[PDB]
Swiss-Prot record:
UniProt protein name: Large ribosomal subunit protein eL30
GO terms of molecular function: RNA binding; structural constituent of ribosome
Native species: Thermococcus celer
Keyword Zinc annotated: no
Endpoints of the signal sequence: none
Stored SUPFAM superfamilies: L30e-like
Length: 102
């Protein structure tokens, strides 16, 4: 009960729509309209700079995951080191609060 990233993220997965991967997420940044896009801090700069820029120009709010892709994969349930995840539809989740306020 303290704007828990994990709770909101799994809740978004349950009562929303979350894209998990890296290249797939870039496509949403390029020409999509995802409410929030999250990228792991320990993700490859090629991936991060590409997504962060593409999303930013599209006006898609990016959030930096406080961890590595391995931890991210473990949290969501992707046993392939998920580099980036797109919170396209958060739903009940207010995870966008972390990546949608400045």
């Amino acid at each position: 009960g303290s704007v828990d990233f994990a709770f909101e993220l799994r809740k978004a997965q349950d009562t929303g729509k979350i894209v998990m991967g890296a290249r797939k997420s870039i496509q949403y940044a390029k020409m999509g309209g995802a409410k929030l896009i999250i990228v792991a801090r320990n993700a490859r700069p090629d991936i991060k700079e590409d997504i962060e820029y593409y999303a930013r120009l599209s006006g898609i709010p990016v959030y930096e995951f406080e961890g590595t892709s391995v931890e991210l994969g473990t949290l969501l349930g992707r046993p392939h080191t998920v580099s980036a995840l797109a919170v396209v539809d958060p739903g009940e989740s207010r995870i966008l609060a972390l990546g949608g306020k400045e």
